[PDB]
Subunit: 391 residues, 4 copies
Amino acid sequence: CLVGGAHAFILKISSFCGLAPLRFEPRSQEYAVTISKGKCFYSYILVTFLVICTIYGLVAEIGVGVEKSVRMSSRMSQVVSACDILVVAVTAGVGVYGAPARMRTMLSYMENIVAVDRELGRHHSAATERKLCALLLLILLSFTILLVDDFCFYAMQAGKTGRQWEIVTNYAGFYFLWYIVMVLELQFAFTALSLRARLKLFNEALNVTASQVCKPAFVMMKTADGVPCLQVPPCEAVGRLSRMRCTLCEVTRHIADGYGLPLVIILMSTLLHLIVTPYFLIMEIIVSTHRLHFLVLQFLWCTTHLIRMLVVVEPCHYTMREGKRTEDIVCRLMTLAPHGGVLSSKLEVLSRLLMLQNISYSPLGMCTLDRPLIVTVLGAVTTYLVILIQF
Amino acid sequence: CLVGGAHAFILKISSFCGLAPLRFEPRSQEYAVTISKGKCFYSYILVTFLVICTIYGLVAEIGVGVEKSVRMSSRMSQVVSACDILVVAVTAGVGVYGAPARMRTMLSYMENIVAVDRELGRHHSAATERKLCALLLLILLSFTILLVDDFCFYAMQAGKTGRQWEIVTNYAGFYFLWYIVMVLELQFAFTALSLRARLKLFNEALNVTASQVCKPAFVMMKTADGVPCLQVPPCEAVGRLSRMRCTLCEVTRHIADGYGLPLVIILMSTLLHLIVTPYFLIMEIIVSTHRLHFLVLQFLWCTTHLIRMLVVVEPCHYTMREGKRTEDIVCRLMTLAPHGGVLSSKLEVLSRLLMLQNISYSPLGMCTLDRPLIVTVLGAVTTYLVILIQF
Amino acid sequence: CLVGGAHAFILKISSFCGLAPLRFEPRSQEYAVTISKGKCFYSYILVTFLVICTIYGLVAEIGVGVEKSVRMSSRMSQVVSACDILVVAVTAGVGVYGAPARMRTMLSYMENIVAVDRELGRHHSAATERKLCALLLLILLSFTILLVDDFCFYAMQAGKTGRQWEIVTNYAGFYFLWYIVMVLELQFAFTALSLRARLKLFNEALNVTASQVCKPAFVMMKTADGVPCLQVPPCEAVGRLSRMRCTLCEVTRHIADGYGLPLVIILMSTLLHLIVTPYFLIMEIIVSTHRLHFLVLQFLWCTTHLIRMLVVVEPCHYTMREGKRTEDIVCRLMTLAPHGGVLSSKLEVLSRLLMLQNISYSPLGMCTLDRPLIVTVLGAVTTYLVILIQF
Amino acid sequence: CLVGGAHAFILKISSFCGLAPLRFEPRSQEYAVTISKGKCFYSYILVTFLVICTIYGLVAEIGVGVEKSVRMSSRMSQVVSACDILVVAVTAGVGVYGAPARMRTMLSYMENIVAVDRELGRHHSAATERKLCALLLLILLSFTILLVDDFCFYAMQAGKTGRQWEIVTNYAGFYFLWYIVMVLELQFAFTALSLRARLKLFNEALNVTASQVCKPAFVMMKTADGVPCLQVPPCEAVGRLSRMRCTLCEVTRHIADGYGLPLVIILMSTLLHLIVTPYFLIMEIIVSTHRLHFLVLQFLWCTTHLIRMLVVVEPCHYTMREGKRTEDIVCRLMTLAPHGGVLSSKLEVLSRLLMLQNISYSPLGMCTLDRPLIVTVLGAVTTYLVILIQF
């Protein structure tokens, strides 16, 4: 098995988190990849250690009570902080303990994607992977910088009373589990975008099928000018592309299964944090609005909990749009195809595939990842805030 | 008519409840079954007796007022307890009074399922039925143990003032109606899972149809190694399987009709209890949090009201997934099938059946049983609790 | 044009309300029907008179203020009573002013339904029309009896202080507008059920098509035993039935257009009244619970506002179920039909009609009339009541 | 490129707003149109100037505080006024800065619509364009009159204390941004209605196809009587119309993309204003109800925020209805078409296009513009108001 681009890059990053217990073997543009049981062992230790340190750190700060426990200014603030920590520990737990089975799934289906790549002539655009690798760095580095500021702030807030080393021992684990949760979200997105790039490329082979029938080996090649061009009759190409369309839908279901449970806990904790964080921001902007550094951080957290949702639902939406574009192309193409020909009989099949096999991500069946899920989540958030804030 | 496995086992359990007024006649791996009017008569008496005892027990505890009526610490607590008892008495009532007509329906369609079993070569996996029979015992015995603890607790709470025998006379009926409601939920689930096992087995016959056309009597048999293998040409098999697909969809509609009204009252009472039970738990964890045994029981009830919902919606979701798997297989299979052949003409039919006949449970048309119903119910529960608790 | 049964009976009742400005000419089992401009003129006067009397009666009771205005015990109670009266006056207004155009539509499509009746051999079951005519009498007479009790109660409540004749002059108009709104709801239901009976009868002709192909003039006749039997080859019958299926879907869209705007205002006022009526019931059962006659009436109103919703959504749901039954029959029938025959080519067409033309009522596009609309309405009602009642 | 009617008229109006940076060249019934970079430059200046003046005007009135700041009678009233201004400045910003790319899109697809017009024989009905041009004038002039009254009122309210010139300098910019937002909404509606007129006209060519096959060059012409009549065999017409159906669906997706982001911000601000405006109306009708001129204006604003929503969702709904009418016609037409003919093979294709390519507007994928979006928005509005008003 081989992997490249920003998907291969996030797997390197995820390996240290224990989210991708893989060995990597550098080729020209790709790495060869296999499971490593030693990294699974390391990965299981790391997250278990961090969860123990996080729970006992939580117990310690509850034991300090509500006066000095900066995250826990009240009995109810203790419960909120415990649930916040709990959902992150559960999300990072499911993320890391599930990772070996998820990589076994990835290496299983990637052998079929390689066959699709050959038919499409897939080659990794350096400019495009640089865009997506820069986006990994942008999102992940920005979040890492936020975690450091949040930790430094609360440590200095306690450092004003000499208690910073205890705060470090009690919360350092929680910030590492935060990093693991974002890397898991980025690992999905750039896995899903890596498939969306192949639907997008499959649709271009189907357009050039239409242009050849409109305006008359592996399926598609570059010309001497590098433009896409078709090496086989459209009758054969549509049959070959119909098989590839089935394969891409199967890969979608493996991705949605492997990340399905993580994504549900990520969605609930997003919803939780988008209620909890604006609430205490609003309470603190009405009362003691002089704590400007706190208010800045809590705003940047509200922003981050929205981005973390978009990182999940947007890669899926962009995959839906490529499916809709296929239906548009096939409709056009089958009005062009002549009556009673072989090509139109191949397009009768493909159009049934479009009606039968949709491409979608529905984690555990609870919901469909698409932009209407944003409207659903934000409508709930504002409903609860209007209830909670108004009194 | 004959029935086996965990479905036949839950029918034995349900017979004593009067939910399955059947005689049973043991064969090698199955029971022969027919309606017994005497068990219908017994069943109608039993539930009518228990409902009378429950209503008059409710009247008695309202008559004791709010001081000593342990379930009724206030005027509003009286109304809550009356509605709790009322929905259980209605659910057990519809369950037991409807049971003879429901068994007549079961024995009507099971004669067709036997024909599907012959074509598929269905035989009951001892290991699989042991799994599902152990799951019946696990869920039902755990609930029975909870009912005993709840009853013993409140009787001892009253026994501290000598009034336990009156509590026994006033609530024993209600705990038996609770048991009847769970057995009805388990009777559905293991009826639905018994069908899902046959869709799952029908899909495997359709995969081996694809492998024979990919890599070239009743439809399917075991090899000498026990692997599935096809005794007829794929052209005949797909036609035979299309007929069986229609039969399974028809059986789904009989199950959804027979249990439809029970399931709606089960869903409302789940929603009611998931509001009422966490509310009084939260009031009692803020005030008088020393009543640790009460808080433990009320938590185990909240857990149970979630499980009772999953027992209903999960068997249906797992049945949807087998239908989606059929669409995936048929798409694959009809790209493999050659142009203009008989097989592809048989697959044109089957693909129309998939678009026309879905397999789903929609009780009384109110809703579809699937995991999105969990999100809908839990979002309402938390909306009401946020309203009720916040003031 | 001719019409019979409970549909023809409700048109007689509706004529006096001005909801069906028709002449009627009695035949053996049917009436001949044509528009009468004189009844349109009468109808426009009647509702305009009743609306004037109702508005000026409302103005009078607002002018008496909140002390003696029994419907208006507070400033807010004035606003509630005004909106209650307003939505009924608007619903009866749209009902009666729209009625001539609606009857022109009815007489337009009923000429095509007569053609469907000939093909199906439709004859009116005396026992069935007696059921539906008894249901008209049951629902309408029960409501009329409730209106009289409500009016007599409030007149006697004012009659205890001699003011009953003013109450009569100020509210008699409103009770007649209430009667007009129910007759409009019954006029829809028994129009929709009159179509559902023809889908139900069309599906039976399609089953006997299957039995003739399974077990081998106008389309269908009774045997000498009165059992349905087919007078033409199944190849012709399926073609003839496909045309009739199109005609029934067209009639559905005329009904949904003609009653669409009434039904939306009926749904909002149902939602309004299911909030307003339980609220003031709950306030009056907590405080001054001795007003037993008031509490009884307000409960019977809550019951009536639910029934008025079911009268609207249930006839539509039962029409959906007959469409689903067609899809089940066509799937079965086209697995039975032989490969490459004419019959299977006719069933390819019909199955496309089922996928393209659904049968549904969606008033003004706002919603679909089906039992999920009950869950939507009742969830809102309980959301508002939980907000309003809890403080 | 050429454009006519109320679409061409709203583009003239939009040019001064900078929403359509176009030159216009008058022909007999149409204008020739091309992008003008000078109007893009003017347009970017104008909105940037107005946004600067609006923000600094907002800063000034916040700087005057809450006593004299008539829009800002409290600290919370400051925040409300700032968000109101902010969403309008954002909506007008996206409107005007996006306008050049949107016009490039319009001139791209309008060249294909001209081809559809030739096939359909499209000519602009003077009476119909007069209706839609009068509707532009009615809606836009009525809104302009409301803006003047609102501005004159608040200036005179401040003019009673000599501060009117400062109010003019601080709010004149905001009223011009309000005008730009309505013109953008009208620019969409009359673009969408301009397409709906061509679906409506395409459906009439398909009916006359049915009548010619029922009752036996560019596709369609007027007779010597001006009735539509078909110049080609139905076999060719259905093929030609299938291609045109694809082209119209493509144009729909360009419109939805170009206006998609504006429409989402328009929907949120509609939702915001339908909460905020009735709330402060209700507070001001309970307390100080003597401010009759204020109450009148705030009611006319509530009315306007509903109309602004209908202006957006109704043109889209009317486009859905023409698609449904196509499905009705195609079903009818393909029962009429003879078995095994060429025409029925052309109708097999078109019916797949109807199942694959729907016509809809879904801005950014968040929602579908149709009348169910009204019910969704108004249910939220009343939920928040019931929460906010009740305490």
